[PDB]
Design a protein around this ligand. Structure first.
Ligand code: 003
Ligand code: 003
Ligand code: DGL
Ligand code: DGL
Lengths: 255, 248
């Protein structure tokens, strides 16, 4: 089985890592639109066209399924992409909704959605959760987390101050935190730590990881038993910084 | 004269404002490639191509001269753009070098260049300054300044912490600081306040503004109001910003 993975850049690596461990596919074609990253600060119209152009990139690769690892693209371009695509396209939003549905029985549990400005503004998460019966939903566009993470500021006073900037205004004790952005898993522990040290939470909140969530979904939906190639063929492509992207793949994914 | 102004997005407003105040042109065609901003975080080969493509946008407008308000595009794509352009293309780097020549007589004056990662790695300013005889040139990529400014983090603890993160490691105290990025003028007084508050200085460092520098050059070189906005991203948003901040 040969599939594709699309993201605005290298961020999607966080989703790809999960996919690789789950041995769901024998071959993966990763494509990052690095020349235009980030997507999170842009509008729906622009994002949708980006999504459509991504489909064009994959046509020669003859993939049988496309994973939109980008949360922003999943929120703004997924519907349009699915409209014209002949192969199934799976985003990272619905899988997380289902993940929450399975592990969060209390419909009143306070849920906090974190993502880019575009993702949050879209209310993609909020709407899906409401449809599933959840009644305590809060969202925050922690936009600066993206560039900080890209500069590798994964700890220290600057990150702490940035988290403080976004989280201080919160008047809820989150029991569930959605890491609704490809970049957020890289500071998940820091985020959990902030809430445990700045709030009176009795126990750490449940963190929803987009990659683990989509893995769960794919296994069930497509009846995949984790028996694909052990050392799968993976290609990395991008609209820019491709040499760099390949280096990142070897350095962090050992591919 | 009818001219064009190019930037990766809305940032070029810092230059457009200077142009407008100087009442130099009868008509201006502003284009921000907001679908792909930022340029500063990307590699040179990508930025150069972005610049060439920008030229195509202005062709039907029949502009007489093009201003590249973007410091990053000025640093990386200007040479290539001028190669394939018949109309003059003026960037924001050389004009600043000239201003510095006029305002900084002391060749040993410590000069600090601030800009995007791409602009700083190009050594555009350093090379130009070296060529003109300056002996104490420093540079620093204050990358996070761009997104902080776009999110309107123009004061407070977060900006202070970010400036500290970038400035603390400096060993040389600048007497002159070049705001080599469209966004930096929005935190000019804060950058000024940082050095005045962290060191004992009788007078703040001289800040060089890209917009003011290019206005002087244009008046000089060209012995020198309809304004329309275009964008690869949300043009309506850009026009709304123009109405709010430029009253246009
Ligand atoms: C699959 C990842 C969990 C692996 N990984 C890290 O574990 N860790 C710990 C990483 O640090 C890492 C990095 C990394 C490399 C250089 N600078 C910042 C991050 N990168 C590349 C990278 C680059 C930019 C943004 C990214 C956003 C989301 C995932 C990866 C990103 N990958 C990293
Ligand atoms: C720079 C001045 C001509 C106008 N101006 C402000 O004075 N001031 C004080 C502004 O705040 C300003 C703003 C602004 C609007 C919304 N959020 C942040 C900044 N904007 C729009 C804007 C947006 C993003 C990045 C920009 C980078 C450089 C210049 C302007 C930018 N313009 C602002
Ligand atoms: N990939 C984006 C983050 C980076 C961007 O804004 O392009 C997301 O998951 O929302
Ligand atoms: N216009 C850029 C800043 C924004 C970007 O990186 O594109 C500059 O002047 O360097």
């Amino acid at each position: 089985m040969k599939i594709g993975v699309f993201d605005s850049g290298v961020g999607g690596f966080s989703v790809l890592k999960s996919l690789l461990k789950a041995r769901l596919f024998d071959e993966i074609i990763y494509y990052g639109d690095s020349a235009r990253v980030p997507y999170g600060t842009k509008d729906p119209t622009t994002i949708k066209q980006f999504g459509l152009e991504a489909l064009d990139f994959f046509k020669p690769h003859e993939i049988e399924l496309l994973i939109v690892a980008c949360n922003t693209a999943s929120a703004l371009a997924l519907e349009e992409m699915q409209k014209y695509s002949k192969i199934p396209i799976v985003g990272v939003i619905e899988p997380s909704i289902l993940a929450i549905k399975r592990q969060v029985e209390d419909k009143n549990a306070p849920i906090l959605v974190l993502g880019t400005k575009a993702t949050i503004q879209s209310n993609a998460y909020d709407n899906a959760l409401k449809q599933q019966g959840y009644l305590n939903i809060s969202h925050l566009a922690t936009s600066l987390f993206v560039p900080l993470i890209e500069e590798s500021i994964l700890e220290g006073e600057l990150l702490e101050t940035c988290m403080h900037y976004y989280f201080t205004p919160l008047e809820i004790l989150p029991e569930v935190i959605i890491l609704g952005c490809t970049h957020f898993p890289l500071i998940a522990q820091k985020i959990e730590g902030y809430f445990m040290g700045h709030f009176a939470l009795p126990t750490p909140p449940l963190l929803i990881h987009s990659g683990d969530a989509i893995v769960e979904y794919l296994q069930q939906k497509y009846a995949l038993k984790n028996n694909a190639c052990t050392f799968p063929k993976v290609e990395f492509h991008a609209s820019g910084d491709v040499i760099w992207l390949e280096r990142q793949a070897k350095e962090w994914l050992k591919l």
